[PDB]
């Protein structure tokens with residue numbers, strides 16, 4: 590109901606006040622992103638959320654902070670992620686400046702999804718991905 594929705598917004602705002610990079614869109618950098626790619630634990634603007642939608646459900650799961658209800662598991666993805674952790678991971682593999690169709694289909698981005706998922710489920714992470722495999726795209 591209304592209470593569960595309001596507590597979720599309060600949670601997101603805490604994460605935006607904790608890690609300031611959550612207050613800029615992950616892909617384009619504009620301030621006050623009101624959308625989330627849950628699967629990546631990142632914050633996006635309305636336009637970049639549209640780009641993510643065209644990537645398909647295997648790549649990105651998109652939610653609006655203003656308009657959508659969030660499941661408790663979905664909020665955990667954001668709690669264990671954030672813009673900073675994803676950006677650092679993508680930068681480390683040299684793929685952070687790739688356009689979305691390439692960036693989110695890299696082994697590096699796919700590997701980050703698996704890492705975040707494992708943190709959410711409190712299980713062992715996948716083996717570290719070799720740097721030279723990171724730029725290659727998944728099938």
Ligand SMILES: [Zn+2]
Nearest residue numbers: 614617634637
């Ligand atoms: Zn954007």
